[PDB]
Coordinates of C-alpha atoms and ligand atoms in Angstrom, one line a residue:
Chain H
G21 CA 0.0 0.0 0.0
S22 CA 1.2 3.5 -1.0
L23 CA -1.9 5.6 -0.9
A24 CA -2.3 8.3 1.7
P25 CA -4.6 10.9 0.2
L26 CA -4.9 14.1 2.3
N27 CA -8.6 14.3 1.2
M28 CA -10.8 11.3 1.7
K29 CA -14.5 11.4 1.0
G30 CA -15.2 8.1 2.6
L31 CA -17.1 6.3 -0.2
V32 CA -17.0 2.5 0.5
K33 CA -18.0 0.0 -2.2
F34 CA -18.3 -3.8 -2.0
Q35 CA -18.3 -5.4 -5.5
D36 CA -19.2 -9.1 -5.8
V37 CA -17.3 -9.8 -2.7
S38 CA -16.8 -13.4 -1.7
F39 CA -14.9 -14.4 1.4
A40 CA -13.9 -17.5 3.5
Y41 CA -11.7 -17.5 6.6
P42 CA -8.2 -18.8 5.7
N43 CA -8.5 -21.7 8.1
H44 CA -11.8 -22.7 6.6
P45 CA -11.1 -22.2 2.8
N46 CA -14.3 -23.5 1.2
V47 CA -16.9 -22.4 3.7
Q48 CA -18.3 -19.4 1.9
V49 CA -19.1 -16.8 4.6
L50 CA -19.8 -14.1 1.9
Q51 CA -20.9 -14.6 -1.7
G52 CA -21.7 -12.0 -4.3
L53 CA -21.7 -9.2 -1.7
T54 CA -22.5 -5.8 -3.2
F55 CA -23.3 -2.5 -1.5
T56 CA -22.3 1.1 -1.1
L57 CA -21.5 3.1 2.1
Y58 CA -22.2 6.8 1.4
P59 CA -20.1 9.5 3.2
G60 CA -22.2 11.6 5.6
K61 CA -24.8 8.9 5.9
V62 CA -25.2 6.2 8.6
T63 CA -25.8 2.8 7.1
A64 CA -27.2 0.0 9.3
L65 CA -26.1 -3.6 8.7
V66 CA -28.6 -6.1 10.1
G67 CA -29.4 -9.8 9.6
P68 CA -29.7 -13.2 11.3
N69 CA -26.8 -14.7 13.3
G70 CA -23.8 -15.9 11.3
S71 CA -24.9 -13.9 8.3
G72 CA -21.5 -12.3 8.0
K73 CA -21.9 -8.8 9.5
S74 CA -18.8 -8.9 11.7
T75 CA -16.9 -10.5 8.8
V76 CA -17.8 -7.4 6.7
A77 CA -16.4 -5.2 9.4
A78 CA -13.2 -7.2 9.4
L79 CA -12.8 -6.8 5.6
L80 CA -13.3 -3.0 6.0
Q81 CA -10.4 -2.8 8.4
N82 CA -8.3 -4.8 5.9
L83 CA -7.9 -7.4 8.6
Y84 CA -8.7 -9.9 5.9
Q85 CA -8.7 -9.7 2.1
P86 CA -11.7 -10.8 -0.1
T87 CA -11.1 -14.1 -1.9
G88 CA -13.1 -12.7 -4.8
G89 CA -14.4 -9.3 -5.7
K90 CA -13.2 -5.9 -4.6
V91 CA -13.5 -3.8 -1.4
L92 CA -13.1 -0.2 -2.5
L93 CA -12.4 2.9 -0.4
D94 CA -12.8 6.2 -2.3
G95 CA -12.4 4.4 -5.6
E96 CA -9.2 2.5 -4.9
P97 CA -8.8 -1.0 -3.5
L98 CA -8.3 -1.2 0.3
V99 CA -4.9 -3.0 -0.2
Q100 CA -3.6 -0.1 -2.2
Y101 CA -3.7 2.1 0.9
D102 CA -1.0 2.5 3.5
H103 CA -1.6 0.3 6.6
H104 CA -1.0 3.1 9.1
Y105 CA -2.9 5.6 7.0
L106 CA -5.9 3.3 7.2
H107 CA -5.7 3.4 11.0
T108 CA -6.0 7.2 10.8
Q109 CA -9.1 7.1 8.6
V110 CA -10.8 3.9 9.7
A111 CA -11.8 3.3 13.4
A112 CA -13.9 0.4 14.7
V113 CA -15.6 0.0 18.1
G114 CA -16.8 -3.5 19.1
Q115 CA -18.8 -5.6 21.5
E116 CA -15.3 -7.1 21.8
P117 CA -13.9 -4.1 23.7
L118 CA -10.6 -5.0 25.5
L119 CA -9.1 -2.4 27.8
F120 CA -5.6 -2.6 29.1
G121 CA -4.1 -2.0 32.6
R122 CA -3.1 1.5 31.8
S123 CA -4.8 4.9 32.6
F124 CA -8.1 5.9 31.1
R125 CA -6.4 8.8 29.2
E126 CA -4.0 6.2 27.7
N127 CA -6.9 3.9 26.7
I128 CA -8.7 6.8 24.9
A129 CA -5.6 8.1 23.1
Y130 CA -4.7 4.5 22.0
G131 CA -3.1 4.5 18.6
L132 CA -3.4 8.3 18.0
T133 CA -0.7 9.8 15.8
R134 CA -0.2 12.7 18.2
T135 CA -0.4 13.8 21.8
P136 CA -3.9 14.9 22.8
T137 CA -4.7 17.6 25.3
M138 CA -6.9 17.0 28.3
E139 CA -9.6 19.3 26.8
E140 CA -9.5 16.9 23.8
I141 CA -9.7 13.7 25.9
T142 CA -12.5 15.1 28.2
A143 CA -14.5 16.1 25.1
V144 CA -14.7 12.7 23.5
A145 CA -15.3 11.1 26.9
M146 CA -18.2 13.6 27.5
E147 CA -19.6 12.7 24.1
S148 CA -19.3 9.0 24.8
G149 CA -20.7 9.5 28.3
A150 CA -17.5 8.2 30.0
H151 CA -16.4 11.5 31.6
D152 CA -18.6 11.3 34.7
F153 CA -17.6 7.9 36.1
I154 CA -13.9 8.5 35.3
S155 CA -14.0 11.9 37.1
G156 CA -15.3 10.1 40.1
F157 CA -12.0 8.3 40.6
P158 CA -9.3 9.7 43.0
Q159 CA -6.7 9.6 40.3
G160 CA -9.2 10.7 37.6
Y161 CA -8.1 10.0 34.0
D162 CA -4.7 8.7 35.3
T163 CA -6.6 5.7 37.0
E164 CA -5.1 2.5 35.6
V165 CA -7.9 0.2 34.3
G166 CA -8.3 -2.9 36.4
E167 CA -6.5 -6.1 35.5
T168 CA -9.4 -7.9 37.2
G169 CA -11.3 -8.3 33.9
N170 CA -14.5 -7.1 35.5
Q171 CA -13.4 -4.1 37.5
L172 CA -15.7 -1.9 35.3
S173 CA -19.4 -1.9 34.1
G174 CA -20.4 -3.2 30.7
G175 CA -21.7 0.2 29.4
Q176 CA -18.9 2.0 31.1
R177 CA -16.4 -0.1 29.2
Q178 CA -18.1 0.6 25.9
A179 CA -18.2 4.3 26.7
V180 CA -14.4 4.2 27.0
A181 CA -14.1 2.1 23.8
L182 CA -16.3 4.6 21.9
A183 CA -14.3 7.7 23.0
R184 CA -11.2 5.8 21.8
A185 CA -12.5 5.9 18.2
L186 CA -14.0 9.4 18.5
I187 CA -10.7 11.0 19.3
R188 CA -9.2 9.4 16.1
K189 CA -11.7 11.5 14.1
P190 CA -12.0 8.7 11.5
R191 CA -13.5 9.1 8.0
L192 CA -15.1 5.6 8.5
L193 CA -16.6 4.6 11.8
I194 CA -17.5 1.0 12.2
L195 CA -19.8 0.1 15.1
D196 CA -19.8 -3.7 15.6
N197 CA -22.6 -4.1 18.2
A198 CA -20.9 -1.4 20.3
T199 CA -24.2 0.0 21.4
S200 CA -25.8 -3.1 23.0
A201 CA -24.3 -2.5 26.4
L202 CA -25.3 1.2 26.5
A203 CA -28.5 2.4 28.2
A204 CA -31.1 4.4 26.2
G205 CA -29.6 7.5 27.8
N206 CA -26.1 6.9 26.5
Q207 CA -27.7 5.4 23.4
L208 CA -29.2 8.8 22.5
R209 CA -25.9 10.4 23.2
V210 CA -24.3 8.3 20.4
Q211 CA -27.3 8.7 18.1
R212 CA -27.3 12.5 18.5
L213 CA -23.5 12.5 18.0
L214 CA -23.8 10.5 14.8
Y215 CA -27.0 12.2 13.4
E216 CA -27.3 15.6 15.0
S217 CA -23.7 16.8 14.9
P218 CA -21.8 18.8 12.2
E219 CA -18.6 16.9 12.9
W220 CA -20.1 13.5 12.1
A221 CA -22.2 14.8 9.3
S222 CA -19.3 14.6 6.9
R223 CA -18.2 11.0 7.9
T224 CA -19.6 7.6 7.0
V225 CA -20.8 5.3 9.7
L226 CA -21.4 1.5 9.5
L227 CA -23.8 0.6 12.4
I228 CA -23.8 -3.2 12.9
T229 CA -26.6 -3.9 15.4
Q230 CA -29.1 -6.7 16.4
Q231 CA -31.2 -3.9 17.9
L232 CA -33.6 -3.1 15.0
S233 CA -34.8 0.0 16.9
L234 CA -31.4 1.6 16.2
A235 CA -31.4 0.6 12.5
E236 CA -34.9 2.0 12.2
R237 CA -33.6 5.6 12.3
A238 CA -30.5 4.9 10.0
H239 CA -30.3 6.7 6.7
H240 CA -29.8 3.3 4.9
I241 CA -30.2 -0.3 5.9
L242 CA -28.4 -3.4 4.6
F243 CA -30.1 -6.7 5.3
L244 CA -27.6 -9.6 5.2
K245 CA -28.7 -13.2 4.8
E246 CA -26.5 -16.1 4.0
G247 CA -23.6 -13.8 3.3
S248 CA -25.5 -11.7 0.7
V249 CA -27.6 -8.6 0.5
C250 CA -31.2 -9.9 0.8
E251 CA -32.8 -6.5 0.8
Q252 CA -31.7 -2.8 0.7
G253 CA -33.1 0.6 1.4
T254 CA -34.5 2.8 4.2
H255 CA -36.9 1.7 6.9
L256 CA -40.1 2.6 5.1
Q257 CA -38.9 1.2 1.8
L258 CA -38.0 -2.1 3.5
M259 CA -41.3 -2.0 5.4
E260 CA -43.7 -1.8 2.5
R261 CA -41.6 -4.5 0.7
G262 CA -42.8 -7.0 3.3
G263 CA -39.9 -9.4 2.9
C264 CA -36.8 -10.3 4.9
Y265 CA -36.5 -7.0 7.0
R266 CA -40.2 -6.6 7.6
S267 CA -40.8 -10.3 8.6
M268 CA -38.0 -10.0 11.1
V269 CA -39.4 -6.8 12.5
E270 CA -43.0 -8.2 12.4
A271 CA -42.2 -10.3 15.4
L272 CA -41.4 -7.6 18.0
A273 CA -43.0 -5.4 20.7
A274 CA -45.2 -2.5 19.5
Chain S
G141 CA -6.0 -9.3 21.4
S142 CA -5.9 -7.8 24.9
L143 CA -2.2 -8.0 25.8
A144 CA -0.2 -4.8 26.2
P145 CA 2.6 -5.5 28.7
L146 CA 4.7 -2.5 29.8
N147 CA 7.8 -4.7 29.8
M148 CA 8.6 -6.8 26.7
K149 CA 11.8 -8.9 26.5
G150 CA 11.3 -9.5 22.8
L151 CA 11.6 -13.3 22.7
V152 CA 10.2 -14.7 19.5
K153 CA 9.4 -18.4 19.0
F154 CA 8.2 -20.3 15.9
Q155 CA 6.8 -23.7 16.8
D156 CA 6.0 -26.2 14.0
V157 CA 4.6 -23.3 12.0
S158 CA 2.9 -24.1 8.7
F159 CA 1.5 -21.5 6.4
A160 CA -0.3 -21.0 3.1
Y161 CA -1.6 -17.8 1.6
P162 CA -5.4 -17.7 1.9
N163 CA -5.7 -17.3 -1.9
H164 CA -3.6 -20.4 -2.4
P165 CA -4.8 -22.7 0.5
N166 CA -2.8 -25.9 -0.2
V167 CA 0.4 -24.5 -1.5
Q168 CA 2.5 -25.0 1.6
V169 CA 4.9 -22.0 1.8
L170 CA 6.0 -23.0 5.3
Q171 CA 6.0 -26.4 6.9
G172 CA 7.3 -27.5 10.3
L173 CA 9.0 -24.1 10.9
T174 CA 10.8 -23.9 14.2
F175 CA 13.3 -21.3 15.5
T176 CA 13.9 -18.8 18.2
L177 CA 14.8 -15.1 18.0
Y178 CA 16.7 -14.0 21.1
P179 CA 16.4 -10.5 22.5
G180 CA 19.6 -8.4 22.2
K181 CA 20.8 -10.6 19.4
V182 CA 20.7 -10.1 15.6
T183 CA 19.4 -13.1 13.8
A184 CA 20.0 -13.4 10.0
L185 CA 17.4 -15.2 7.9
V186 CA 18.9 -16.4 4.6
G187 CA 18.0 -18.9 1.9
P188 CA 17.2 -19.4 -1.8
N189 CA 14.4 -17.5 -3.6
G190 CA 10.8 -18.4 -2.6
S191 CA 12.0 -20.2 0.5
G192 CA 9.6 -18.1 2.7
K193 CA 11.7 -15.4 4.2
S194 CA 9.4 -12.5 3.5
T195 CA 6.5 -14.7 4.5
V196 CA 8.1 -15.2 7.9
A197 CA 8.4 -11.5 8.2
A198 CA 4.7 -11.1 7.4
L199 CA 3.7 -13.6 10.1
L200 CA 5.8 -11.7 12.6
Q201 CA 3.8 -8.5 12.0
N202 CA 0.6 -10.6 12.4
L203 CA -0.3 -9.6 8.8
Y204 CA -1.2 -13.3 8.4
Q205 CA -1.9 -16.1 10.9
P206 CA -0.2 -19.5 10.7
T207 CA -2.4 -22.3 9.5
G208 CA -0.7 -24.7 11.9
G209 CA 1.7 -24.2 14.8
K210 CA 2.3 -21.1 16.9
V211 CA 4.0 -17.8 16.5
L212 CA 5.0 -16.7 20.0
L213 CA 6.1 -13.3 21.3
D214 CA 7.4 -13.2 24.9
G215 CA 5.6 -16.5 25.6
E216 CA 2.1 -15.6 24.4
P217 CA 0.6 -16.1 20.9
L218 CA 0.8 -13.1 18.6
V219 CA -3.0 -12.9 18.2
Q220 CA -3.4 -12.4 21.9
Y221 CA -1.7 -9.0 21.7
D222 CA -3.4 -5.7 20.9
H223 CA -3.0 -4.7 17.3
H224 CA -1.9 -1.2 18.0
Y225 CA 0.3 -2.4 20.8
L226 CA 2.1 -4.6 18.3
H227 CA 2.7 -1.5 16.1
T228 CA 4.5 0.1 19.1
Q229 CA 6.7 -3.0 19.7
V230 CA 7.2 -4.4 16.2
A231 CA 8.6 -2.3 13.3
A232 CA 9.6 -3.6 9.8
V233 CA 11.6 -1.9 7.0
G234 CA 11.5 -3.4 3.6
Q235 CA 12.8 -3.4 0.0
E236 CA 9.1 -2.5 -0.6
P237 CA 9.5 1.0 0.9
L238 CA 6.7 3.3 -0.2
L239 CA 6.9 7.0 0.6
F240 CA 4.0 9.4 0.4
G241 CA 3.6 12.9 -0.9
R242 CA 4.1 14.4 2.5
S243 CA 7.1 16.0 4.3
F244 CA 10.1 14.0 5.3
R245 CA 9.4 14.7 8.9
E246 CA 5.9 13.3 8.4
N247 CA 7.3 10.2 6.6
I248 CA 9.7 9.5 9.5
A249 CA 7.1 10.1 12.3
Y250 CA 4.7 7.8 10.4
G251 CA 2.5 5.9 12.9
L252 CA 4.2 7.2 16.0
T253 CA 1.9 7.4 19.1
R254 CA 3.2 10.9 20.0
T255 CA 4.6 14.1 18.5
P256 CA 8.4 13.9 18.0
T257 CA 10.7 16.8 18.4
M258 CA 13.1 17.9 15.6
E259 CA 16.1 16.8 17.8
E260 CA 14.4 13.4 17.8
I261 CA 13.7 13.3 14.0
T262 CA 17.2 14.6 13.1
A263 CA 18.8 11.9 15.3
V264 CA 17.2 8.9 13.6
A265 CA 17.8 10.4 10.2
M266 CA 21.5 10.9 11.1
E267 CA 21.7 7.3 12.3
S268 CA 20.0 6.2 9.0
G269 CA 22.2 8.5 7.0
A270 CA 19.2 10.5 5.6
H271 CA 19.9 13.8 7.4
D272 CA 22.4 15.1 4.9
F273 CA 20.4 14.9 1.7
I274 CA 17.2 16.1 3.4
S275 CA 19.1 19.1 4.9
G276 CA 20.1 20.0 1.4
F277 CA 16.5 20.9 0.4
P278 CA 15.3 24.5 0.6
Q279 CA 12.3 23.4 2.7
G280 CA 14.4 21.0 4.6
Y281 CA 12.4 18.3 6.5
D282 CA 9.2 20.0 5.5
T283 CA 9.9 19.1 1.8
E284 CA 7.1 17.0 0.5
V285 CA 8.2 13.7 -1.0
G286 CA 7.8 13.6 -4.8
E287 CA 4.7 12.1 -6.3
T288 CA 6.9 11.2 -9.3
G289 CA 7.7 7.8 -7.9
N290 CA 11.3 8.3 -8.7
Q291 CA 12.1 11.8 -7.4
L292 CA 14.5 10.2 -4.9
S293 CA 17.5 7.8 -5.0
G294 CA 17.2 4.1 -4.0
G295 CA 19.4 4.3 -1.0
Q296 CA 18.1 7.7 0.0
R297 CA 14.6 6.2 0.1
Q298 CA 15.7 3.3 2.2
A299 CA 17.5 5.7 4.6
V300 CA 14.2 7.5 5.1
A301 CA 12.4 4.1 5.5
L302 CA 15.0 3.0 8.1
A303 CA 14.7 6.1 10.2
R304 CA 10.9 5.6 10.2
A305 CA 11.3 2.4 12.2
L306 CA 14.2 3.7 14.4
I307 CA 12.1 6.5 15.8
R308 CA 9.5 3.9 16.8
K309 CA 12.1 2.3 19.1
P310 CA 10.6 -1.1 18.5
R311 CA 11.3 -4.2 20.6
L312 CA 11.4 -6.2 17.4
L313 CA 13.1 -4.8 14.3
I314 CA 12.5 -6.7 11.0
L315 CA 14.8 -5.8 8.1
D316 CA 13.3 -7.4 4.9
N317 CA 16.1 -6.7 2.4
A318 CA 16.1 -3.1 3.6
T319 CA 19.9 -3.0 3.3
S320 CA 20.4 -3.9 -0.4
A321 CA 20.0 -0.3 -1.7
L322 CA 22.4 1.1 0.8
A323 CA 26.1 1.6 0.0
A324 CA 28.8 0.1 2.2
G325 CA 29.2 3.4 4.0
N326 CA 25.5 3.6 5.0
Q327 CA 25.7 -0.2 5.4
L328 CA 28.2 0.2 8.2
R329 CA 26.1 2.9 9.8
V330 CA 23.2 0.4 10.2
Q331 CA 25.6 -2.4 11.3
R332 CA 27.2 -0.2 13.9
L333 CA 23.8 1.0 15.0
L334 CA 22.5 -2.6 15.4
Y335 CA 25.7 -4.1 16.8
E336 CA 27.8 -1.3 18.4
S337 CA 25.0 0.6 20.2
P338 CA 23.7 0.4 23.7
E339 CA 20.2 1.3 22.5
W340 CA 19.9 -1.6 20.1
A341 CA 21.7 -4.0 22.4
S342 CA 18.5 -4.7 24.3
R343 CA 16.3 -5.3 21.2
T344 CA 16.0 -8.3 18.8
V345 CA 16.6 -7.9 15.1
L346 CA 15.6 -10.1 12.2
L347 CA 17.9 -9.4 9.3
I348 CA 16.5 -10.8 6.1
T349 CA 19.2 -10.5 3.4
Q350 CA 20.4 -12.1 0.2
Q351 CA 23.8 -10.5 0.9
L352 CA 25.6 -13.3 2.8
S353 CA 28.3 -10.8 3.8
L354 CA 25.9 -9.1 6.2
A355 CA 24.7 -12.4 7.6
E356 CA 28.3 -13.4 8.2
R357 CA 28.6 -11.0 11.1
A358 CA 25.2 -11.8 12.6
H359 CA 24.9 -13.4 16.1
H360 CA 22.7 -16.2 14.7
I361 CA 21.8 -17.4 11.2
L362 CA 18.7 -19.2 10.1
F363 CA 19.0 -21.0 6.7
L364 CA 15.6 -21.4 5.1
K365 CA 15.0 -24.0 2.4
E366 CA 11.6 -25.2 1.1
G367 CA 9.8 -23.4 4.0
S368 CA 11.8 -25.1 6.7
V369 CA 15.0 -24.6 8.7
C370 CA 17.7 -26.5 6.8
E371 CA 20.5 -25.4 9.1
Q372 CA 21.0 -23.2 12.1
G373 CA 23.9 -21.6 14.1
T374 CA 26.6 -18.9 13.7
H375 CA 28.8 -18.4 10.7
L376 CA 31.7 -20.6 11.9
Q377 CA 29.3 -23.4 13.0
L378 CA 27.5 -23.3 9.7
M379 CA 30.9 -23.2 7.9
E380 CA 32.4 -26.3 9.4
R381 CA 29.1 -28.1 8.8
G382 CA 29.7 -27.9 5.0
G383 CA 26.0 -28.2 4.1
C384 CA 23.4 -25.8 2.8
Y385 CA 24.8 -22.5 4.1
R386 CA 28.5 -23.4 3.3
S387 CA 27.7 -24.7 -0.2
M388 CA 25.8 -21.5 -1.0
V389 CA 28.7 -19.4 0.2
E390 CA 31.2 -21.7 -1.4
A391 CA 30.3 -20.1 -4.8
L392 CA 31.3 -16.5 -4.1
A393 CA 34.1 -14.0 -4.4
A394 CA 37.1 -14.3 -2.0
Ligands
ATP602 N1 -12.3 -16.3 13.1 C1 -13.1 -17.2 12.4 N2 -12.6 -18.3 11.8 C2 -13.5 -19.1 11.2 N3 -14.8 -18.9 11.0 C3 -15.3 -17.8 11.5 C4 -14.5 -16.8 12.2 N4 -15.3 -15.8 12.6 C5 -16.6 -16.1 12.2 N5 -16.6 -17.3 11.5 C6 -17.8 -17.9 10.8 O1 -18.3 -17.0 9.9 C7 -19.7 -16.9 10.0 C8 -20.1 -15.4 10.0 O2 -19.7 -14.9 11.3 P1 -20.0 -13.3 11.7 O3 -19.4 -13.1 13.0 O4 -19.7 -12.4 10.5 O5 -21.6 -13.4 11.8 P2 -22.4 -12.2 12.5 O6 -23.4 -11.7 11.4 O7 -21.5 -11.3 13.2 O8 -23.3 -13.0 13.6 P3 -24.1 -12.4 14.7 O9 -25.2 -11.6 14.0 O10 -24.5 -13.5 15.6 O11 -23.1 -11.4 15.4 C9 -20.1 -17.6 11.3 O12 -21.1 -18.6 11.0 C10 -18.9 -18.1 11.9 O13 -19.0 -19.5 12.1
ATP603 N1 0.8 -12.5 -1.6 C1 1.1 -13.7 -2.0 N2 0.1 -14.5 -2.4 C2 0.3 -15.8 -2.8 N3 1.5 -16.4 -2.8 C3 2.6 -15.7 -2.4 C4 2.4 -14.3 -2.0 N4 3.7 -13.8 -1.6 C5 4.5 -14.8 -1.8 N5 3.9 -15.9 -2.3 C6 4.6 -17.2 -2.6 O1 5.2 -17.7 -1.4 C7 6.5 -18.2 -1.7 C8 7.5 -17.6 -0.6 O2 7.6 -16.2 -1.0 P1 8.6 -15.2 -0.1 O3 8.4 -13.8 -0.6 O4 8.5 -15.5 1.4 O5 10.0 -15.8 -0.6 P2 11.4 -15.1 -0.2 O6 12.2 -16.0 0.6 O7 11.1 -13.7 0.3 O8 12.0 -15.0 -1.7 P3 13.3 -14.1 -2.1 O9 14.4 -14.8 -1.3 O10 13.4 -14.2 -3.6 O11 13.0 -12.7 -1.6 C9 6.9 -17.7 -3.1 O12 7.2 -18.8 -3.9 C10 5.7 -17.0 -3.6 O13 5.3 -17.6 -4.9
MG604 MG1 -20.5 -11.1 15.4
MG605 MG1 10.8 -11.5 -0.8
NI606 NI1 -2.3 -2.1 12.0

C-alpha cells in the first residue's frame, strides 16, 4: 500500500465480494456481496446470526482480504492504501472491547498519531458518556484500568471504547454491536452525536446492530442473509416491501 | 487481542509453523518451521528465492496467521496481543519502501503514538544516513516527497524508511532486504547501530538479506529451504558443517 490521500470522501464500495476464513477455505461466509456506504450517511447492517456482519467489518479494516471481488475505499482497493494511513481514517468499536491495565487517558488516546490535550480527551469522553464515572476516581483519568477483567461496568467499558475511536476522528466509523451495552440515555448520546452533529455529518458510519430499533432511524439499511444482501433501502422502503427485513421486525414489541 | 505488557523482552518463537496464503490454500509455503529469535541478538534469515523469508516477516507482524503451529512473542501467541500495541513494539523496514507525498518529517514520524521533536527526528535520520540529503533541500524536513515515484534515490529512500522504524524504538526490528540499496558506507552505519550501540543491544533484530556478507557477522543465522529450517547456528558453526549454508557461500568472491 502506498496511498495516503490528504482528502478522503469516505465512499465505500463492495463489489461481488466473496470471502472465506483462511482456516476454513471453502466455507463461503460471503458470496456475491455488493453494497455502497455513502459518506455523511449512517448505514445500518442487520441480519440473522452468522450472516457475515462482523466479517464485513473485518474486511473493511483490511484485517482480511476478499477471496473474490473488490473492497473499495474512495475508488481505490483497500490493499492499495498504507496500513497506518488506514488506521488514521478507519476506526472500529466493538462488543469485543478490550481495555488494558493503563490509565483511562492512555486507553482513549490509544493509537493516536499525536499527543492529545486534556480538553480533547475530556471532550470525547463527554460525548461517549464516560467522563462522569472517570472523574469520580481519585486519580481521575490517570486511573489504571483494572486487570481484574470485570473491574468496570459493561456500558462504562463501551463508553471508553467509543471515545477511543471518536478522538481518532476517522473518516469511516464501524460500530460492531458497540451500542448493546449502552443504556437508552447513553444510546441517545451516540445517536445525536452521529446524526445531530456537524462533525459527524461529513463522515460515513457503519452501524452493525441486532437492535432493530437503532437501525430504524438509520439513513440506509443493509439486510444480510447467507452472506449476501437480501434487501436494501430505508426503513419505510423495507417495510412496504414485506420481505426479509419486515418479517424479522414483524415479530417484535409494539 | 488484549495484551499490552509494559515490559517486553522480545523473545520470538516459531513452533512447528505451517502457512499457506489464503488465496492459495494448499500450496505450503512454510512447513514445520521452528526457530527462536533471542532479544539483544541479531538473527539473520537467509536462503534461496521463494523459501519463505518474507512470509516469515509477514507472520511476525501478524499480517497473516499460521495455518498450523504457533508464533509466540514473549511467551504468548501473537494474536493475543493488541493490534496497535504490536505496532509500538514491532517495526519492519522493507525493500518495498513506499513513501507518500508528505514532508520528510511526516514520513519519519509515520505511525508514532506521539509528537516527536526535531532533535528526535534529526537523530534517527542521522543514524540512518538520511539527514544530509534532506538538509540540502530548501524546505528541509518540510519538503514534500515527490509524487513522481522516482524523485529520490534508491538508498536515499531506504534511509528514510529506516529512520521511520528507528524513531518507533521497537522491541522487534524486522529488516526485509532493507539494506540492499544502501552503500557500504551507509551499510556500516546500520551495522554499527545494530551491533555497536547500547540502545539496540537490548532489542531483537531479524535481518532478512540475500547479501551473505551481512549475515556473516550476525549473532545467529537461520537457513531457510523449502519453507523449513535447513540449518542453524553462527557463521563458523555453519561453515564447518559444510552443508546448505556453506555450499551456498562456497560459490562466491574471496
Ligand atoms: N475467526 C473465524 N474463523 C473461522 N470462521 C469464522 C470466524 N469468525 C466467524 N466465522 C464464521 O463466519 C460466519 C459469520 O460470522 P460473523 O461473526 O460475521 O456473523 P455475524 O453476522 O457477526 O453473527 P451475529 O449476528 O450472531 O453477530 C459464522 O457462521 C462463523 O461460524
Ligand atoms: N501475496 C502472496 N500470495 C500468494 N503467494 C505468495 C504471496 N507472496 C509470496 N507468495 C509465494 O510464497 C513463496 C514464498 O515467498 P517469499 O516472498 O516468502 O520468498 P522469499 O524467501 O522472500 O524469496 P526471495 O528470497 O526471492 O525474496 C513464493 O514462492 C511465492 O510464490
Ligand atoms: Mg458477530
Ligand atoms: Mg521476498
Ligand atoms: Ni495495523
